[PDB]
Amino acid sequence: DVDWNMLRGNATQAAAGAYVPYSRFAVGAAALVDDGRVVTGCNVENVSYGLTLCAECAVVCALHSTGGGRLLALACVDGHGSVLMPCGRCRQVLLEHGGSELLIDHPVRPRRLGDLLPDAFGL
Amino acid sequence: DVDWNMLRGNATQAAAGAYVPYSRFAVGAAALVDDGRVVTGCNVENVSYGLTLCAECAVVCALHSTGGGRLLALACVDGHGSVLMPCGRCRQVLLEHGGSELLIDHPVRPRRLGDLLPDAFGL
Amino acid sequence: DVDWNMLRGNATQAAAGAYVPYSRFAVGAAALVDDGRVVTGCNVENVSYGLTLCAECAVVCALHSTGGGRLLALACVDGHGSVLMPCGRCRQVLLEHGGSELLIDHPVRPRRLGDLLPDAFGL
Amino acid sequence: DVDWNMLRGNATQAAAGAYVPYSRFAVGAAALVDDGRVVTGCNVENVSYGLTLCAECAVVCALHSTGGGRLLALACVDGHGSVLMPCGRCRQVLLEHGGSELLIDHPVRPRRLGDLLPDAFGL
Ligand SMILES: [Zn+2]
Ligand SMILES: [Zn+2]
Ligand SMILES: [Zn+2]
Ligand SMILES: [Zn+2]
Structure with missing residues (x-):
């Protein structure tokens, strides 16, 4: 159902655009939306x-x-294409738009956002 | 050189996508980048x-x-297509990517970002 | 070891200062720091x-x-003194300053931040 | 009316608390509120x-x-006690709480916030 290799690859592509002169720590993300398009x-x-x-x-x-x-x-990936867990802020903003059922790429198996941000504030 | 009617129109289009259930105050933006493409x-x-x-x-x-x-x-426009000045946070982030010479649509004449955020922090 | 009734009470006091004209949703917080002082x-x-x-x-x-x-x-509490889980952004910022072992007031038992933000980005 | 040497000094003191391991760029601030107390x-x-x-x-x-x-x-000062202009985000948040008449320490003369964030969004 979700082509994770594709999403991860798009996240890896997307990382290439990062404007990160302070940290030099590039992050890319790619998401599948309910209509099948992917946004990065x-x-x-x-x-x-x-x-x-x-x-x-x-x-x-x-x-x-x-x-x-x-x-x-x-x-979500770093500039090396390694899977990254979203920061807490991102977990909150993703929740607004994917809810608890939004799958987040890996650990060794994509996680529900609900599990990454349990007992989430506040709607 | 800058088709402001076009940019403003794209900002107006872009406003249509706003996710604003709390404020109901939609904002759209559109920018001309140095290669001639517009991003919204x-x-x-x-x-x-x-x-x-x-x-x-x-x-x-x-x-x-x-x-x-x-x-x-x-x-930058509201959901009514009225020209909006960017909030201070946006003025700072735009500066990073357009510098002081970035033109910002209206008052009655587009403004330099430099004038909208004078003596800007901090590079 | 942690007087939760005290912390929660201080969070409730602190909520009284909220500047929340847009949401009308006051939030207060109080924390015990390693030297025994509480900050709100x-x-x-x-x-x-x-x-x-x-x-x-x-x-x-x-x-x-x-x-x-x-x-x-x-x-963390609302203006009604109800226990609130911190938003994702707050979970990330608290982690920087309390780590995974930071206790967060309730559900029915304070939670480790580590459990509220599992597999946290990124240090 | 405003003891700027005092405010600047308090901002300089306050800078000492900065948690800035990423940038190593400490910033402190101190403000005079309408009741004469100073907050940092x-x-x-x-x-x-x-x-x-x-x-x-x-x-x-x-x-x-x-x-x-x-x-x-x-x-507002850096860790060296040099006067800093607030970033755009700070100019917006200060405006909410001081309005356009809020004086901001220097250039060579404190500035009105109104002049630092002209034509401010949006109330
Ligand atoms: Zn994030
Ligand atoms: Zn803004
Ligand atoms: Zn929060
Ligand atoms: Zn700032």
Whole structure:
């Protein structure tokens, strides 16, 4: 049902766009939306660190700038193509758009977002 | 040189994608990048308000997820198609990607970002 | 070892300071730091929603503006004094300052942050 | 009316608390509130860069966790005690709490926030 090799690959591609001059730590993400399209995002840092955009947040922006809908699955990777768990902020924003059933690429098996952010605030 | 009617129109289109169930205040943005392509973004709210994504930040994500480069001009509008000045956070993130010379759609004449965020922190 | 009734009460007090004109949803937090002092925080909203400050983030700011150290326990509550789980963003920021062993007030028993943000990004 | 030497000094003190292991770029802030008390804040970074808290945002949290009110004047400094202009995000959050008349320490003369964030979004 979810081609994880494809999603992960798109996340790996997407990582290539990261604007990460401060950390040099590129992140890409790719998500499958409920209509079968995939949207991607990369890391975008800012001199004011707290204004940096996460790749998974970029994905959510793409989601809504391309017709919205629900996220079914997301892979997040570093610039080396390694699977990354989304930061807590991203877990919260993904939840809004995929709910607890959103699959997040690996550990050794994609995880439900619900398990990555249990007892989530607040709707 | 900059088709502002086009950019503003794209920002107006882009506003249609806003996920704004909390504020009901849709924002769209569209920017011209140095290679002539235009990238767009809309507002994406979250139950945790501080995780909401600005449309202009969505634009910057699109920028880098589509090859990066420099932003030359940006229009930001509300869901009514009215010109909006970017919030301070967006002014900072746009600066990273357009610098002080980035034109921002209107007042009655597009403004340099440099004038919208004078004496900007911090590079 | 942790007076949860005290922490929760301080979180309830702290909620009273929330600047929440947009959501009307007050949040307070109080944390015990490794030296036995307690630091508190409340929700601070902004017209640009994504600039709203979480109460638990306020706590972390207090932590470092009062000598830093490690967070041992945190209660987060709404304006009604109900226990709230921190949003994903707060779970990530708390982790930086309390690690996985940081106790977070309730469900029916305080939880390790590690369990609230399993397999956390990224250090 | 505003003891800027005092505010700047408090901002310099406050900078000492910064949690800045990623950038090593400490920021402190101190603000005078309408009741004459001063509240302070420092920079707090996170591994997820975009979750870093600005010192001026820390100030606003202190403001409301200490009774709220309006900010009259703010100095922001780096770890070297040099005057810093607030990032765009901070200019927006300060505006909510000080309005356009909030004085911001230097260039060679404190500036109105209104001039640092002209034509501000959006209330
Ligand atoms: Zn993230
Ligand atoms: Zn904005
Ligand atoms: Zn939070
Ligand atoms: Zn700032």
